[PDB]
Enzyme design. Structure first.
Site, mmCIF file in Angstrom:
data_model
loop_
_atom_site.group_PDB
_atom_site.id
_atom_site.type_symbol
_atom_site.label_atom_id
_atom_site.label_comp_id
_atom_site.label_asym_id
_atom_site.label_seq_id
_atom_site.Cartn_x
_atom_site.Cartn_y
_atom_site.Cartn_z
ATOM 1 N N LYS A 1 0.870 -1.161 0.000
ATOM 2 C CA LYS A 1 0.000 0.000 0.000
ATOM 3 C C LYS A 1 0.901 1.204 0.000
ATOM 4 C CE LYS A 1 -2.425 1.452 3.589
ATOM 5 N NZ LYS A 1 -3.546 1.380 4.527
ATOM 6 N N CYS B 1 1.785 13.511 -8.328
ATOM 7 C CA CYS B 1 1.107 12.652 -9.224
ATOM 8 C C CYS B 1 -0.133 11.974 -8.617
ATOM 9 C CB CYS B 1 2.050 11.665 -9.826
ATOM 10 S SG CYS B 1 1.346 10.469 -10.995
ATOM 11 N N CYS C 1 -2.040 9.972 -10.914
ATOM 12 C CA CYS C 1 -2.273 9.029 -11.937
ATOM 13 C C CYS C 1 -1.372 7.735 -11.982
ATOM 14 C CB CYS C 1 -2.073 9.576 -13.299
ATOM 15 S SG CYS C 1 -0.464 9.949 -13.966
ATOM 16 N N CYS D 1 4.452 14.766 -10.110
ATOM 17 C CA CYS D 1 3.863 14.785 -11.477
ATOM 18 C C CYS D 1 4.931 15.122 -12.507
ATOM 19 C CB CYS D 1 2.772 15.800 -11.438
ATOM 20 S SG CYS D 1 1.984 16.110 -13.099
ATOM 21 N N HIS E 1 0.250 12.197 -17.044
ATOM 22 C CA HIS E 1 -1.194 12.122 -16.963
ATOM 23 C C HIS E 1 -1.842 12.520 -18.341
ATOM 24 C CE1 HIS E 1 -0.200 16.294 -15.581
ATOM 25 N NE2 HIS E 1 -1.112 16.570 -16.522
#
Ligand code: FES
Ligand code: FES
Lengths: 74, 74
Positions: free
Chosen positions: B24, B41, B43, B52, B56
């Site tokens: 997890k 991020c 995505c 990021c 995406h």
């Protein structure tokens, strides 16, 4: 074996239902307005999106994935 | 019509390749150690995950989804 879907470039959405009239869901928060701790959803299943509500537990168990949230604190 | 997959409970992973020995994936950051701005991020496609890197854009165009990052600034 005939049962296995070979390695392939993903076609599945990550977000299924959240704000789907927005073509790219971005959130921006100023750290001074954050309290002591914010828990942000990274799984797109939270009812309280963009905050985590533990929905990721159900996603992970149902799909075999391993995602979880992002914590900004202090 | 015979071509449409009816409404169903999702079975697809969101994360496909990131840290898959961690069951997890949680990140936690102290706002005092953050600079002026962090772009996270949401995505699970960024090479610089948990930050990021614009991946995406490719996810969204390839899957028709609408996800994007989380910005903590100031
Ligand atoms: S509900 Fe989405 S990461 Fe917790
Ligand atoms: S690379 Fe994942 S949200 Fe931008």
């Amino acid at each position: 074996k005939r049962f296995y879907v070979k390695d392939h470039r993903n076609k599945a959405m990550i977000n299924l239902h959240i704000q789907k009239d927005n073509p790219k869901i971005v959130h921006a928060f100023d750290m001074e307005d954050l309290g002591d701790k914010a828990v942000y959803c990274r799984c797109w299943r939270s009812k309280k999106f963009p905050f985590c509500d533990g929905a990721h537990t159900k996603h992970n168990e149902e799909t075999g994935d391993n995602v979880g949230p992002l914590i900004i604190k202090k």
